[PDB]
Amino acid sequence: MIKQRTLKNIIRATGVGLHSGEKVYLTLKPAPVDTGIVFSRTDLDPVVEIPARAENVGETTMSTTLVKGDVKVDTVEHLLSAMAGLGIDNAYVELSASEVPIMDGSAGPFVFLIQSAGLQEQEAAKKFIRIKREVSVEEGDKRAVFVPFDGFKVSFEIDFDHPVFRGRTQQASVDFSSTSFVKEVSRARTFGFMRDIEYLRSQNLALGGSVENAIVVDENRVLNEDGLRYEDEFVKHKILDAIGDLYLLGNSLIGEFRGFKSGHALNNQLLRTLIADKDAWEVVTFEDARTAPISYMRP
Ligand SMILES: CC(C)C(=O)N1C[C@H](NC(=O)[C@@H]2C[C@@H](O)CN2)C[C@@H]1C(=O)NCc1ccc(C#CC#CC2CC2)cc1
Ligand SMILES: [Zn+2]
């Protein structure tokens, strides 16, 4: 064997920052073995690169933000989700502004741009982090857990007290060795309540938000004319966000993630607690893909 992968070709995209409302030009570039995912702010002289690693995560309530000095990259979770879902080890991500473009609110556009360019196997073993021990963090009624598991699996439960959610599935569990990230998860869009959006605009947040890139919910119903892509899109989006945050570990996981009302802050607590507890994980490679607990789509 299981080899590292980068992109076969450069991918360019244009979009708006969900939070900033800024137009942003995005370029995904191939990268050498053991680069990881590195974000670059090309609008600054000199360019600032922030490796997409747990240690570089800014103190952030809405999205996952990387920081170095007073430079930031906002809303990395959907793109990193896309890269995690296709098993991209190495890539440079160029941005003309502080925020990754939101596209349609899901990882769908990213997965497509990436799979249009195609992938490149590289002459070097893919390193994996295998969960050896259970690791859990709680705070109030939120819980985030890692469980040893021979594969990669994400379960999540949310519980909003809202007519839309109450009469919709708020639990989901997806084993990615037997279920398509691409088909079952990647198209799941971010969501916001009409009441919060009014306030957030007031504070110059959500300035790029529209029905074009978010599920907009009022008191009772989804306002998006065309409705939901999945009956359980909300909890599916939460799994997509978690897979993005998990990728800040800097290697693909062999294990299970369970989220109970968890978010970016607790996800990040769990990553830090996992990194710090070296008894709970090991790094492993696989000389024989045929026998390994995880598999990849052809390049
Ligand atoms: C309910 C909240 C607290 C919650 O727990 N969330 C969990 C999920 N998190 C996410 O998806 C994270 C956070 C986002 O960054 C992207 N990945 C969604 C939701 C969230 O954080 N959503 C922020 C938000 C999204 C869209 C809009 C929008 C607009 C629009 C308009 C114009 C017509 C009026 C506003 C806010
Ligand atoms: Zn999200």
Side-chain angles (χ1 to χ4, degrees), residues 2-22 24-165 167 169-194 196-197 199-218 220-230 232-259 262-299:
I2 300 188
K3 303 201 131 168
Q4 306 196 12
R5 301 169 146 198
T6 192
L7 301 157
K8 192 181 301 304
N9 292 300
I10 299 181
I11 304 101
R12 272 160 279 124
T14 299
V16 71
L18 175 55
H19 295 306
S20 67
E22 292 188 338
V24 46
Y25 301 94
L26 171 74
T27 302
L28 306 181
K29 301 192 149 164
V33 152
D34 301 313
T35 299
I37 314 309
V38 181
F39 289 83
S40 283
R41 286 279 310 284
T42 62
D43 56 310
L44 303 167
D45 187 325
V47 167
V48 183
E49 327 210 313
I50 309 175
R53 299 190 65 81
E55 67 219 314
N56 294 334
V57 169
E59 267 158 22
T60 179
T61 74
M62 286 276 98
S63 36
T64 298
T65 301
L66 302 170
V67 298
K68 191 173 185 198
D70 8 73
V71 175
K72 69 179 195 174
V73 181
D74 287 22
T75 323
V76 298
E77 62 266 28
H78 300 176
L79 177 57
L80 285 176
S81 193
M83 274 161 175
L86 304 178
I88 300 162
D89 296 286
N90 308 306
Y92 291 112
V93 173
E94 292 190 11
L95 300 176
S96 49
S98 62
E99 190 169 4
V100 174
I102 191 60
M103 312 308 297
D104 72 350
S106 80
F110 293 135
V111 159
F112 168 73
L113 284 177
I114 290 173
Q115 291 283 84
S116 301
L119 297 189
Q120 175 59 70
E121 288 192 354
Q122 301 170 290
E123 297 320 310
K126 204 192 224 300
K127 269 171 285 148
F128 292 83
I129 302 162
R130 190 186 84 80
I131 300 291
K132 284 185 36 170
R133 301 287 169 272
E134 166 156 339
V135 185
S136 56
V137 294
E138 316 176 20
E139 206 165 319
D141 71 341
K142 304 181 166 62
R143 188 155 150 82
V145 199
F146 279 129
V147 186
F149 178 76
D150 239 31
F152 186 59
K153 177 167 173 193
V154 182
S155 315
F156 217 101
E157 186 176 2
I158 47 158
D159 177 29
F160 290 91
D161 190 350
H162 197 273
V164 175
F165 287 79
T169 326
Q170 286 213 90
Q171 202 278 343
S173 184
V174 182
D175 172 348
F176 290 97
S177 300
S178 72
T179 294
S180 174
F181 171 84
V182 174
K183 293 188 307 212
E184 293 304 344
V185 174
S186 71
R187 292 198 315 120
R189 300 163 289 172
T190 190
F191 56 95
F193 295 90
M194 202 58 210
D196 304 341
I197 293 157
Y199 166 67
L200 290 162
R201 291 285 208 72
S202 98
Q203 302 281 325
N204 297 109
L205 284 165
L207 296 182
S210 85
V211 289
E212 298 299 310
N213 57 31
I215 309 163
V216 184
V217 188
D218 79 0
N220 272 320
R221 48 182 202 81
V222 169
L223 292 194
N224 308 57
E225 261 190 27
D226 299 328
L228 300 175
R229 300 187 170 170
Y230 311 105
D232 61 355
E233 184 165 8
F234 304 111
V235 71
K236 290 264 191 96
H237 187 81
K238 293 294 305 183
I239 287 169
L240 186 168
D241 280 343
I243 289 169
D245 297 338
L246 262 39
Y247 224 46
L248 299 166
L249 279 182
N251 296 104
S252 283
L253 258 169
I254 303 172
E256 176 178 356
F257 171 98
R258 306 190 180 160
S262 175
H264 287 311
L266 199 65
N267 287 0
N268 189 249
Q269 273 198 71
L270 179 71
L271 302 166
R272 291 180 174 232
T273 307
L274 173 72
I275 286 158
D277 191 350
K278 288 208 212 304
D279 282 341
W281 56 281
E282 42 170 30
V283 168
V284 305
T285 65
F286 292 114
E287 281 181 2
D288 195 335
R290 287 169 312 166
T291 61
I294 289 187
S295 52
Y296 288 105
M297 299 187 270
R298 58 195 179 76

